[PDB]
Design a protein around this ligand. Structure first.
Ligand SMILES: O=c1[nH]c2ccccc2c2ccccc12
Length: 115
């Protein structure tokens, strides 16, 4: 059910998304900007391990297309992106450290969502 507050909450989500894509966080956000090109990266097992790829450009397209109906649906995709990283890579890999830092940005600001 659409709630009166869903548009306002989606504006907060869009703010978060813009922040995740901003220069401020680019040092650690960059691996998440675009879909993983598994072939290009030689990760020939990526799509056997990751059933539901997700990345920030896809989240942006879904936001622009009004695909997300509520904040929880948005959050689920952003968290799916991080989970994919945690699933595929050894936990000591630099990309996992970058994921944890970007997820910290996400979770702390998501927690400030108006309600
Ligand atoms: O989860 C990722 N694991 C990787 C492992 C090796 C090289 C690149 C990546 C990568 C690149 C962009 C986005 C996510 C990932």
């Amino acid at each position: 059910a659409a709630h009166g507050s869903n548009p306002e909450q989606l504006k907060h989500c869009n703010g978060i998304l813009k922040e995740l894509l901003s220069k401020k966080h680019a040092a650690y956000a960059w691996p998440f900007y675009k879909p993983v090109d598994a072939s290009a990266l030689g990760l020939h097992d990526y799509h056997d391990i990751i059933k539901h790829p997700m990345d920030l450009s896809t989240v942006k397209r879904k936001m622009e297309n009004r695909d997300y109906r509520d904040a929880q649906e948005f959050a689920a995709d952003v968290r799916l992106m991080f989970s994919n990283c945690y699933k595929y890579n050894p936990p000591d890999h630099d990309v996992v450290a970058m994921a944890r830092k970007l997820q910290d940005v996400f979770e702390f600001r998501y927690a400030k969502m108006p309600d």
